[PDB]
Amino acid sequence: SMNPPPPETSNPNKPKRQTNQLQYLLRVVLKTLWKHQFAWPFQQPVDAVKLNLPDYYKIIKTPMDMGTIKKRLENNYYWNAQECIQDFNTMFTNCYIYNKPGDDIVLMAEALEKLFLQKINELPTE
Ligand SMILES: CO[C@H]1CC[C@H](n2c([C@@H]3CCCC(=O)N3c3ccc(F)c(F)c3)nc3cc(-c4c(C)noc4C)ccc32)CC1
């Protein structure tokens, strides 16, 4: 099987706005997770061809990753902060769907998710 194309990251037909919460999601939340020791597997779409995982995209139909999330933020793809938070959650739960619970990559995603939730609790008002 081929890989699917990556998720859309820009849509000129979607309205665009800057908000304090979206800026925080980019400049603090995403940046902190990006620099975490376990970030590398989550920095781009899963290359199931390279990883020899022919069933990945048979099981995962809503792929999401931090490279896509960051591009979405940079392209003003999200109107509401909750849309971005949803994509982070999708990334984590995809890992928990595809992989067996004791697997190293699941433990790594759990560590990233714990830090994510801490940073989301510091989201500013507005
Ligand atoms: C830019 O090149 C990429 C970097 C991440 C590489 N990678 C790796 C590399 C190569 C394969 C073996 C290995 O140990 N990897 C690795 C290497 C260094 C790390 F710091 C690390 F956390 C993992 N493992 C990946 C696992 C996943 C994954 C996700 C997310 N959900 O389910 C699975 C399976 C995704 C990517 C993985 C694949 C090539």
Residue numbers in the entry: 42 to 167
What does the paper say about this structure?
Many proteins, including the EP300/CBP histone acetyltransferases (HATs), contain several targetable domains. EP300 and CBP broadly regulate the activity of other proteins through their protein acetyltransferase catalytic activity. EP300/CBP are critical gene-regulatory targets in cancer, with existing high potency inhibitors of either the catalytic HAT domain or protein-binding bromodomain (BRD). Using crystallography, we identify the binding mechanism of the EP300/CBP-specific BRD inhibitor CCS1477 in complex with the EP300, CBP and BRD4 BRDs, and define components of the CCS1477 catalytic binding core that are required for compound activity.
To understand the structural basis for the observed differential binding affinities of CCS1477 between EP300/CBP and BRD4, we next solved the co-crystal structures of the respective bromodomains with CCS1477. As expected, CCS1477 binds through canonical hydrogen-bonding interactions of its dimethyl isoxazole moiety with a conserved asparagine residue in the acetyl-lysine (Kac) binding site (CBPN1168, EP300N1132, BRD4N140). Additionally, the BRD4 binding pocket contains a WPF shelf that imposes steric hindrance on CCS1477 such that the side chain of BRD4W81 undergoes a conformational change to accommodate the difluorophenyl moiety. In EP300/CBP, an analogous tryptophan residue is not present, and instead the equivalent LPF shelf is less bulky and facilitates interaction with CCS1477. Superposition of CCS1477 as bound in the respective Kac sites reveals an altered binding pose, reflecting the reduced shape complementarity between CCS1477 and BRD4, as compared with EP300/CBP. Further analysis of the binding energies by isothermal titration calorimetry (ITC) confirmed significantly stronger interaction of CCS1477 with the bromodomains of CBP and EP300 (Kd = 4.0 and 26 nM, respectively) than with BD1 of BRD4 (Kd = 403 nM). Notably, activity against BRD4 was reduced by ~10-fold, indicating that the hydrophobic van-der-Waals (VDW) interactions observed between the difluorophenyl moiety of CCS1477 and the WPF shelf of BRD4 contribute to binding affinity, but relatively less so in the EP300/CBP bromodomain.
